[PDB]
């Protein structure tokens, strides 16, 4: 009926990690190759590269992420990166105009903006549709942050060695998550499941991204516009 | 005493290739990651990547460059790229303020600008000193363009297979070069040699760039700021 000291240390830790790695001002966005509205590919690529960087920083600060092997950190990051990015982008997503809005109109990404980076306007449907549902759940910062750490710490990913110690870390986080809602979120008797459903939503979005990403990554005139980080994270090289 | 029709076709061809690949307005420079005055590394990296692209385009248009094997094209481009880039940058170099000036002050590269991309202010001396000498020679567009094609077509590079057919192409170009000066450049009885000396100057600058480039390319936090093209051209992978 009340969260325990350690469940609270965990929440505190994650919240800060996210403040420390999610720039509310989006001030770094002027250092990206500018948007031109595959004319958006250089900018989005930089946005995604940058975002991978934040995600990595966030992860390092998840309780017991660092005690994992380098190999598992990499395995978890590579497979979960795009999902974390999709999740975190929800903070900039806006229901009023169905667009991610990043502190200025040079940094407003609408659905046409995005077709201009090589994706089909209709394999983007699920992503928008997902941001809108996620948004509707009016997550607490605590829960948003918790969902991301739970995502990252999915042991059901290609390449993970210790899917027993990662299961442990995840379970602990779902424990925190589930209590938090119960104890601290009026009207959320049904939320945990809605969120968990979002984790499965993500898997599919992940799948879809990989298919399009494979398409671009195979045409050198496109791959050349990515960054070394993107190429490495989204690449199929194997530890 | 007068250049032959074919020597003139060659000159015409090179001049155009250079117009077709050297944007006098430098209008593409707004698509680079902006300069911040290793804070200049993202911008210069984009400048260099872009420049490699032009150089490649130029090369393709050199008489008989395309009839070479893919392998030799690559071998010639990889080893000569930085030299061509250094040469071509002379068009934007200014004696009045010892700086490359690219159509706007966001695009004025002075020597401090450059230390901020990871190089020593004193392994840059030779490069500035070289631009200044090159500038002093007040090359005709014809000769500037000819020197670049002669550079590219140096057969004394690592990896070149047919250093007999490339020697042929180069010789032919030096023939054109040498006649052009004789027939069309008053006061240039000594120039060809001064230029040829510049080709050897370049080799050393090349050497020096490789040493610094190796330094940056080995620290992932730096290599990550380069582009796929830069990494590939300047990389040591072997055909």
């Amino acid at each position: 009926h009340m969260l325990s000291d350690e469940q609270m240390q965990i929440i505190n830790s994650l919240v800060e990690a996210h403040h420390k790695t999610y720039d509310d001002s989006y001030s770094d966005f002027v250092r990206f190759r500018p948007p031109v509205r595959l004319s958006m590919l250089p900018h989005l690529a930089d946005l995604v590269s940058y975002s991978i960087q934040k995600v990595i920083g966030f992860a390092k600060m998840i309780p017991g992420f660092r005690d994992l092997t380098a190999e598992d950190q990499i395995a978890l990051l590579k497979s979960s990166a795009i999902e974390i990015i999709m999740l975190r982008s929800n903070q900039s997503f806006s229901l009023e105009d169905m667009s991610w809005s990043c502190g200025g109109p040079d940094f407003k990404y609408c659905i046409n903006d995005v077709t201009k980076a090589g994706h089909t306007l209709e394999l983007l449907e699920p992503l928008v549709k997902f941001q809108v549902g996620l948004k509707k759940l009016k997550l607490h910062e605590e829960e948003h942050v918790l969902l991301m750490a739970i995502c990252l710490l999915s042991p059901d990913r290609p390449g993970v060695q210790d899917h027993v110690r990662i299961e442990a870390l995840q379970d602990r986080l779902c424990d925190v998550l589930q209590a938090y809602i119960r104890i601290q979120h009026p009207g959320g008797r049904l939320l945990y499941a809605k969120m968990i459903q979002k984790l499965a939503d993500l898997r599919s979005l992940n799948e879809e991204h990989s298919k399009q990403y494979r398409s671009l990554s195979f045409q050198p005139e496109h791959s050349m516009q990515l960054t070394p980080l993107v190429l490495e994270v989204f690449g199929s090289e194997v530890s | 005493h007068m250049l032959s029709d074919e020597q003139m076709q060659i000159i015409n061809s090179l001049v155009e290739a250079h117009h077709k690949t050297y944007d006098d307005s430098y209008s593409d420079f707004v698509r680079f990651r902006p300069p911040v005055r290793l804070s200049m590394l993202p911008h210069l990296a984009d400048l260099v990547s872009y420049s490699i692209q032009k150089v490649i385009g130029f090369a393709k248009m050199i008489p008989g460059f395309r009839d070479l094997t893919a392998e030799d094209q690559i071998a010639l481009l990889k080893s000569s790229a930085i030299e061509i880039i250094m040469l071509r940058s002379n068009q934007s170099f200014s004696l009045e303020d010892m700086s490359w000036s690219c159509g706007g002050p966001d695009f004025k590269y002075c020597i401090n600008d450059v230390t901020k991309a990871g190089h020593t202010l004193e392994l840059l001396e030779p490069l500035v000193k070289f631009q200044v000498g090159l500038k002093k020679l007040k090359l005709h567009e014809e000769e500037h363009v000819l020197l670049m094609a002669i550079c590219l077509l140096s057969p004394d590079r690592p990896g070149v297979q047919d250093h007999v057919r490339i020697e042929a192409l180069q010789d032919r170009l030096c023939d054109v070069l040498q006649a052009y000066i004789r027939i069309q450049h008053p006061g240039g009885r000594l120039l060809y040699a001064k230029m040829i000396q510049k080709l050897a100057d370049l080799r050393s600058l090349n050497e020096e760039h490789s040493k610094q480039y190796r330094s940056l390319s080995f620290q992932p936090e730096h290599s990550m700021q380069l582009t796929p093209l830069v990494l590939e051209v300047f990389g040591s992978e072997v055909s």
Partner: peptide, 10 residues
């Protein structure tokens, strides 16, 4: 393999 991820994980 994974030059940069490794570096950013130290």
């Amino acid at each position: 393999k994974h030059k940069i991820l490794h570096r950013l994980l130290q």
